[PDB]
Design a binder for this molecule. Structure first.
Ligand SMILES: CC(=O)SCCNC(=O)CCNC(=O)[C@H](O)C(C)(C)COP(=O)(O)OP(=O)(O)OC[C@H]1O[C@@H](n2cnc3c(N)ncnc32)[C@H](O)[C@@H]1OP(=O)(O)O
Length: 268
C-alpha cells in the first residue's frame, strides 16, 4: 500500500524536520517505495514539512550539460559551439542520474533555478531567489555559490535512502581546503543572457575528485570518504521516510568536518 502525504510528513517530523528549516534532499525513489501519487507525493510532503517560511534546495544540474564535450579545451569545439542548446533555466530538465525526484522539484510552481548549467540548483521558498543567484561560472560549489549561502543559513542535508557519495555540500569543503595538488578542470557552458546565447569558458575545482587518489572512477571520491568517516563518528537523526532509511545532517557541521578531514591528510 502506497505511502500517503500525511504519513511522510509525520516521518519527516520524527526525523527532526521542523517548519522553517532549509533542507537539501538527496533521494532514492526506489528506496522510498510506491507513493500515493508518484514522486510528487514526496515533494508535497517536503514542502509541508518545512512550512511556508522554510526552503528546499536541490542540486539538479542539467540533462544536456556539455561538460564532457568541452572538458579540457580553452573553448567549445566547433561542432559543439555551433549547435548546442543554450541553458534556459526555467526550461532545462534536470540530470536524471542525480535522482528522478529533481525533475519534480524543478517543475514545482515558484521554483527557481541557478544560471550555472552544470552545477544548477533548484530552490523553493522565500529564500529561493537569494539561494539561486548569483551562480557564476568558476564558482560551482565553493564561495559565492548556492551551497555557500546554504551553509550560511543553517541548512540541513536530508539523505533519503541515498549513499554517502551524494553529499553535494561537501564540494564546498574541497573548494576551500588548504591542501596541495587540488585538481582543477576547464569546460565551457552555453549561457542565456538577455535571450542571447553566450559561451562561457571557465576553470573550477574538479567536482569528480579534488585529488588524484580520490578521482579514480572505481572509485570512491573524496565526498564519499568524508561522509562515511563523518557518519561513523557523529550522532545523526536517523529514521524512515517511506521505506528508505534516512538521515538529517547538519550541513555546516559536516562541511567543517570535511575541511578538517582534508587538511589533516594532505600538506598545504
Ligand atoms: C557529491 C555530489 O554532488 S553527487 C551529485 C548529486 N547526486 C544526488 O543527489 C543523488 C541522490 N540520490 C541517490 O544517490 C540515489 O541512490 C540514486 C538516484 C543515485 C539512485 O537511486 P534510484 O532510486 O535507483 O533512482 P531514482 O531516485 O531517480 O528513482 C528511480 C525510479 O524513479 C522512476 N521514474 C523516473 N522518472 C519518473 C517519472 N517522471 N515519473 C515517475 N517515476 C519516474 C524510475 O522509473 C524508477 O522507478 P522504477 O523502479 O520503476 O524503475
Amino acid at each position: 500500500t502506497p505511502w500517503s502525504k500525511s504519513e511522510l510528513v509525520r516521518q519527516l517530523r520524527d526525523l527532526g524536520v521542523r517548519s522553517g528549516d532549509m533542507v537539501m534532499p538527496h533521494v532514492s525513489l526506489r528506496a522510498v517505495g510506491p507513493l500515493a501519487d508518484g514522486p510528487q507525493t514526496l515533494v508535497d510532503a517536503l514542502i509541508e514539512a518545512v512550512g511556508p517560511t522554510g526552503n528546499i534546495l536541490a542540486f539538479v544540474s542539467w540533462r544536456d550539460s556539455p561538460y564532457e564535450q568541452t572538458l579540457g579545451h580553452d573553448a567549445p569545439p566547433a561542432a559543439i559551439a555551433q549547435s548546442w542548446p543554450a541553458f534556459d533555466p526555467d526550461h532545462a530538465p534536470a540530470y536524471p542520474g542525480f535522482g528522478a525526484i529533481n525533475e519534480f522539484i524543478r517543475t514545482y510552481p515558484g521554483c527557481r533555478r541557478t544560471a550555472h548549467p552544470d552545477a544548477s540548483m533548484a530552490a523553493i521558498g522565500p529564500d529561493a531567489a537569494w539561494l539561486v543567484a548569483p551562480h557564476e561560472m568558476g564558482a560551482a560549489y565553493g564561495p559565492r555559490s548556492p551551497i555557500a549561502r546554504f551553509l550560511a543559513h543553517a541548512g540541513k542535508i536530508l539523505s533519503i535512502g541515498a549513499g554517502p557519495d551524494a553529499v553535494t555540500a561537501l564540494h564546498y569543503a574541497e573548494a576551500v581546503a588548504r591542501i596541495e595538488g587540488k585538481r582543477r578542470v576547464t569546460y565551457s557552458m552555453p549561457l542565456l543572457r538577455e535571450g542571447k546565447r553566450v559561451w562561457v569558458t571557465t576553470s573550477d575545482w574538479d567536482s569528480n575528485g579534488i585529488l588524484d587518489e580520490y578521482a579514480a572512477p572505481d572509485g570512491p571520491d573524496a565526498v564519499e570518504r568524508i561522509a562515511r568517516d563523518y557518519l561513523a563518528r557523529t550522532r545523526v537523526a536517523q529514521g524512515p521516510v517511506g521505506g528508505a532509511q534516512s538521515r538529517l545532517i547538519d550541513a555546516a557541521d559536516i562541511v567543517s568536518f570535511g575541511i578538517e578531514w582534508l587538511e589533516a591528510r594532505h600538506a598545504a
